[PDB]
Amino acid sequence: VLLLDVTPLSLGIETMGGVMTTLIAKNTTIPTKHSQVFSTAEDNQSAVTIHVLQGERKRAADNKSLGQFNLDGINPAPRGMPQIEVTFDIDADGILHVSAKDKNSGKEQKITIKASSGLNEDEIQKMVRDAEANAEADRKFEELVQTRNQGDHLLHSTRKQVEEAGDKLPADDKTAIESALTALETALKGEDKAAIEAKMQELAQVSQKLMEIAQQ
Amino acid sequence: VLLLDVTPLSLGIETMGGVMTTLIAKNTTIPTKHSQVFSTAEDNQSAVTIHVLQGERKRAADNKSLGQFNLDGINPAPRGMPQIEVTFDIDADGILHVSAKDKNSGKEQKITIKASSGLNEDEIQKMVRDAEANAEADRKFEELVQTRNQGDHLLHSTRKQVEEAGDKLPADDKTAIESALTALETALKGEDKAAIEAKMQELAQVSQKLMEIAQQ
Amino acid sequence: VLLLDVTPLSLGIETMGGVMTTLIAKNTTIPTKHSQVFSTAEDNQSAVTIHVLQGERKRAADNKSLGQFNLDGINPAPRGMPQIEVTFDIDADGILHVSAKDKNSGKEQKITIKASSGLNEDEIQKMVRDAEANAEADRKFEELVQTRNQGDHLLHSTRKQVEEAGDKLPADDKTAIESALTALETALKGEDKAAIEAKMQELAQVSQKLMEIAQQ
Amino acid sequence: VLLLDVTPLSLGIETMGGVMTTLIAKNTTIPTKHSQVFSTAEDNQSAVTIHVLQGERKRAADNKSLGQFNLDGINPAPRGMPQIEVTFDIDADGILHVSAKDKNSGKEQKITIKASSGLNEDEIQKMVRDAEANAEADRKFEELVQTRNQGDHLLHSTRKQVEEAGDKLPADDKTAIESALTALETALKGEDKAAIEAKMQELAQVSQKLMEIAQQ
Amino acid sequence: PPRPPQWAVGHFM
Amino acid sequence: PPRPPQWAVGHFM
Amino acid sequence: PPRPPQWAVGHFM
Amino acid sequence: PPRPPQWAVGHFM
């Protein structure tokens, strides 16, 4: 063959923290099909928005939104335990079928995206140039989001542990731990990587007993 | 300047599943310093081996081992909660100082690696060619390890939940759940991605009540 | 759009020395059209074979031959003077139209190559891997061919100058010059870059008078 | 080794048309040494300026000038016949020694460039970003210069042929040929690729007899 | 259990 | 708690 | 002129 | 021969 039908840009979904996570890489020959198992961001979460993105930027908002749908009826479970399988399937005509399947509930939902959706040739070139020009800014956004995600999981896990310990956790211990959780949650509302990391470290420094107890 | 001192290859550490995780990318100008926070792979783990690797392959064993050390005295906590900060610092002379700091215990350990350690120019070219020739095999190894890691965390989390539920979990429920845990753990000892995923899915299909209970 | 029709591999023609010269680069979106002016390899050459190649290797024989045609009626002129315009035009359906136009004679010839010609997806991947594995060997072939081309032009130009000088060139001078031309032509039949360059240099060392005369 | 001394950017010389021609590629490990044979741009040229450049841009003026020197005493010869060997040799300390040797005269000249010359780390990053942002503009400059070089060689060769034909060239023929040479030389003073090519083609269309004669 | 006001797709443990 | 026979560096939650 | 036995595409001067 | 006012490095034929 002299030509191939290939994707001009990355295809994926928005994930926790406002980041684009790629399911089909740029320059993949079609037809193609790729699945990845994802999960809930918080304990007992009953629904996920699957938000389909096209582009090369790390920030979800900087890419081209192709459409979105919900999968609900996710049954109560700890954060990150339900198995939500997301599949991108591009058929021979270039139509994209995105589906999300909750292996724990059985429920499935899909959206169909026309081959003509998304960015046109000029906008595709602009996207590629943009990703090149902002490769550093995007790297910094990416590392801030992973640190903001780590802090949010540490915040939520420690709150659960506190409540589970109840009276077993000495007053002083609880005081130091609570103080630090509030400090972290404030840092998480902000934009500063190092501040989030310092509040995380402040928490590791006073949580010793809580851990111990939680492990008993 | 007409020349720069730059790394010829990736530097990092071995992580859970026998994978190389990069701390300093290939072609970084020295001096340079990079930290990433890592953690324990199992509940109550008291020590981590920091195993310093040089190279471009995903499998740890396929890269060049520069040395290793332990950090112990990690205090009991749930898997993934202790904050273990690993820092690679290459100074102006090309000497690499790797340290690991447990923010929760305060304990620190380091190793110093001479600038002349690791692969020579020929071996560096061979490494680069090898990574090129095996880019697919390495991608498949990488995805198998992430699936094997996900199953191992799901195995370990579900075992904890079972034990915590004790008598609250109906016999039948427990039976189906236990069956599936054994099936997963066997799949994890194997080499087959799809088999691991099917055992995970078998577990999501019978764990509904356990989750519910665990969430109460 | 979610997909683009793009070339999977380089398209071009065989040029002097058995080398592939690219007209349309790999990963060009179609439709596309590119022209480059080429010429004759020898004084008074009356025809050119246009040999259409697909692939990423420097040696013509290592790429995929798509077809070939002649353009004749090129009028006598010094080597490299006739303007032979070669145009590759891939239309929206992926059909390739190659034409060659002799601006000096007016004559034109073309061939049409179906979109399904050339390498299939597997062979395309093999081609890409091959070019990667042989990037050094190909670089050395490329530099040998440019040196073999330079020597052949120097051989042919000096023979013309000798004949033009006739009796004006002293016997001794002619002797040294002829000796060296024979030595070069033998080196050109061989595979050794350095030997060709040394025979070229041997010729520059005894041609001083011929040049002088040729410049009068 | 953990580090290598490597060039951060391309090193070469300015060539005919105000273009940078690379002798040592970006990311070459030092020490290294590379020679390429170049030549005169015009018949009987007695000297060449060797102008050493650092950078990634195609326009000579857009790169970093490291220094320059002349090689004279080049003996009269047709354009492109003298063998001028240019060698870049970077030694283990990163000092660059550029020399140019006229194989036809024996004469040699060199310049020594300190390892600390050229662009600093920031400017090196800016250079790399600049080459990325202007990859199209540079491609267009590059193709304009090759067309401007081809026209200038065609202009100069045809002027010689005219003079050599003298009275053998019919008045009418000469008239059309001269007209077209003037038109080309004007196009060469301009910035328009297509205009240069059209004047070249205008010349191929009226030069038929001159060629014939020149070939006799 | 109280269900959170959260829609984010997260990573599978 | 019983400490596991595990040395692997894992990811921080 | 004698025409050479040459078919190679060369570069334009 | 008259020497041209030209300093450009050109390509070797």
TrEMBL record, chains E, F, G, H:
Give the location in the cell: Secreted
Q: Organism source for this protein?
A: Bombina maxima
| The protein, known as | Proline rich bombesin-related protein
**What stretch of the complete protein does the chain hold?**
48 to 60 of 121
Family, per entry: Belongs to the bombesin/neuromedin-B/ranatensin family.
